[PDB]
Ligand binder design. Sequence first.
Ligand SMILES: [Mg+2]
Ligand SMILES: [Mg+2]
Ligand SMILES: [Mg+2]
Lengths: 86, 202, 438, 138, 132, 101
Amino acid sequence: RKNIFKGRRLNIFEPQAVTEEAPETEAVPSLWDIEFAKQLAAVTERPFQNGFEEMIQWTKEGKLWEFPINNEAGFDDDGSEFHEHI
Amino acid sequence: RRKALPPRTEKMAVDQDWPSVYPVAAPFKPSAVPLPVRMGYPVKRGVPMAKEGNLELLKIPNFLHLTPVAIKRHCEALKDFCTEWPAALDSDEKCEKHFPIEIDTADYVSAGPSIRNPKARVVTLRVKLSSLNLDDHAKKKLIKLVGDRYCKSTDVLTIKTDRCPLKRQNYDYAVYLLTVLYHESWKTEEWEKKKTEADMEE
Amino acid sequence: EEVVIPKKKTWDKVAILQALASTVHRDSTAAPYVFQDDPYLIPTSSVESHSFLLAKKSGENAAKFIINSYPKYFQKDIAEPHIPCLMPEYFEPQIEDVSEAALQERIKLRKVKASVDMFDQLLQAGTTVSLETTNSLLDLLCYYGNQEPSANYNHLGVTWRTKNNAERIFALMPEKNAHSYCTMIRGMVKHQAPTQALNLYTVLLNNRLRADVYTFNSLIEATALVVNEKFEEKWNNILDLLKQMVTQNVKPNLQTFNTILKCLRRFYAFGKLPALQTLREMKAIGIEPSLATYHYVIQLFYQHESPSKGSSLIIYDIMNEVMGKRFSPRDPDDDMFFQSAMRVCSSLRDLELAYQVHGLLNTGDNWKLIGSDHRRNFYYSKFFNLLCFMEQIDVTLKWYKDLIPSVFFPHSQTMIDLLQALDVANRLDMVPQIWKDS
Amino acid sequence: VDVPKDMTKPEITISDEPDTLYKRLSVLVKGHDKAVLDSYEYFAVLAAKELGISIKVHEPPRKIERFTLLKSVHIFKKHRVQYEMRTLYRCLELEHLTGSTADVYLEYIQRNLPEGVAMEVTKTKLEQLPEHIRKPIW
Amino acid sequence: KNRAARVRVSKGDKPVTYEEAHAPHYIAHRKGWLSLHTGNLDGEDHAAERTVEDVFLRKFMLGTFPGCLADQLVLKRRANQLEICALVLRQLPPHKFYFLVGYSETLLSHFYKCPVHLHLQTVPSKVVYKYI
Amino acid sequence: YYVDWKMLRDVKRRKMAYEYADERLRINSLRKNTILPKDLQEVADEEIASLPRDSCPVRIRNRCVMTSRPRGVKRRWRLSRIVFRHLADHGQLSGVQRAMW
Ligand SMILES: [Mg+2]
Ligand SMILES: [Mg+2]
Ligand SMILES: [Mg+2]
């Protein structure tokens, strides 16, 4: 009749209100974190189960076009306004 | 050796939903289609060939994935990604009154590994001159300045730009021409008084 | 003005397909999409599925071997926009000169023999080497034990060796930081060598260098495996490490608690009460338990005991807590929860409990966490057997058609259970069709 | 009976940028076989009606390209074998279509395009006067 | 006498499939085109690149599946993806068919820099339309 | 291997033209304009003719990409007239049919 989440716990660790304010993502990537990403993603990913699911994976990967089609996709011409050409 | 299993057509239900079988565009699979369909020119005394092992039913672009039952289901889910057209802009005349500039752009889709079409960089900007603030002198100069781009019957000004590689650069260039042609029609320069009686439009 | 411009709607470029993907569900009579729809190529048994699918997977590796073997035959590009995921890759070092910049290329290309040979030449050349690069080189060598990874083509016992390059380079390090000790301890525990890891931790404490989150994760497993003391002595050591963790102000992650519960499975009786204490601590800290966390809890309380009074209380509280939740992957062992949850339902013989487990699996994308093929077959093996007698044959047949053969191929014993259900339900007219499907 | 409960998860973030209004959208599909274009028009019209677009469909006149090649591989220039490429046309006009509705309609149309046809879109976007023209500057 | 893509009459003992039993002047009258793409439309460019790629697949698929190919391929080009439809005899074991399907899909996709779809329909023998 | 030695020569000729395409264009601009002094134009003629012979656009020859037939080649498909019929009569080209009217 007693919930497993209610009762005595370990009080050694204080309850932390917030996480780290500035994560160190812009630094040298630890090898184990990259390995953790591989292990977490590989289990999650499964072989394609439907035609639609194969499209969305391809679209993210870049195999397929980004509909609706714009013929200038991926070519910004060095980000130059019309003045550098006129 | 290995044998051939019976086709799934036998196990297909009478009232099963078709679009679940074909979610995307797929070629005509004879085992996956319960419909007995025959095509091909018949023999002198015979019937057209069956749906198994027939190439004529494979060349055709099938529309099994766009059945009307599936179309309503497909479109209704897409209705979330939409916003209504303002009701006040019902008549086309009011559209001109509240929006006097229309811009024409083109996008091209073709089968291949590349999307780059050099004909997609064109931008056509059309402006009705009656909606601007041109004076009697300024309007006459603008017509004499822009040349053949102005139609005397419909009073529409068409500016077409092709030099910029991208449609966004052409659009910025096209609007640049419109604004510089208006700020220049109001500068009554000194030499403008040297008008000849044969150059008068009226 | 009498016109109001409506605000635009912004969506990602792949969300439009997912809207259409929602309308279409799985097909009952269709073979898995990975395999061809042709009858001659449709798999006929669970044995064929492993043979067929791995044959196709070997095809991709076979082709990619050719692509990487002869890069010059695939350098032509006619793709617009560019697709960087189709260009051939390179494994040989693009720079054959002896320099620090070229050394980093071999480190990042999963090359160990090339990196160690080049590093020795760099040291003999007299040029200085950055500490982070030295640490990065150690991590590559420590993880594989100074060996090469698994490539396409060129258990018992301690894999860690005393005469190893990892210890040799570590001693040669002029400056050693906290990370250098942290990565060395984790490798030792991973390679079933916790005796050296615990000794290094004592040296780490003498250096007054704080340990990161992952270091305490390995230490807790290390302390239990090193010695064979009683639970009370082990528990004191476990609590001792946690007190040291607070002193350095280190917040444990989700995996820190999961490995504790997994190791507590050995103490099938004495660890029942301490396991609940750790679970409540996770809620207080803020780390939401994943599927793997509940997986170790149910198995610890589930033993070969006739009453199962404690286990019933465990599962009932969990399922209500997990009800109506979508779970994201957060642990390498998250895939083993669904198979283990069905094991509990097999003994308890609770059809209603199984539906809550199965209902959770079908919510959102939680179905991707079922596990491997044999785990999927086993998960549906226990679940389908429960559907035979616990429910009316009219609904059991509907689940029989939907689950088989679209999801899994039935086992011989599973067919026996189906036959028993028909006999009890006083229906023998379906027997000829069962044999045909058999 | 067993179905995946609530397998839908798209998000539509409504930002603050005003939507783009298109005065009229023109779609011109070109292909080799009339039957494919006849079916494609029905698919486009049915989807357009459900979204509430009030489209109009007309058939532009077709054009035929012809050329002549020699028959044999040596001499015999009095015998020719001719060939012909037929491009059939079909135009679907869209009027009073917002930018947000334009994006979904086009991409839904484009993804279901048959292999034997292609299309061109002419979008007549409308907008107010430029800032320099609107704001009085001599 | 015309001889383009024709099979000559020889008694009544030689089987002929539907594709080979019709003269070339019957194209777009009784039989369709084995390949469909945008390149040969009225105002569309990039028609030579499609043609050479089409011929290569006629030579690659014929050589990848020796003897077990029934008749000509059907190539459909939608968006940037390439679909290849084939008729294959029941010659190789299913393990080899999936190996070649996996091998063909990866090699062509990394060669033409476009996704490739390979759909197979298996028949017991060559389909006979006339004679026999 | 290209189908013939003649085809190989054309590839070298096209490759050489591409390298000197921009350099030829800049120099050829001086010659084709009458506002520059005649003395400068004579010097330009010497330099433009000092470039390698193969780097000339007019020397490029359009052949068939399959059989390398120097003439009888349709520019759209870049194929010889014999090969084009061979592909078209089998139905292997989309939208190409025997003309009847
Ligand atoms: Mg020769
Ligand atoms: Mg001259
Ligand atoms: Mg010439």
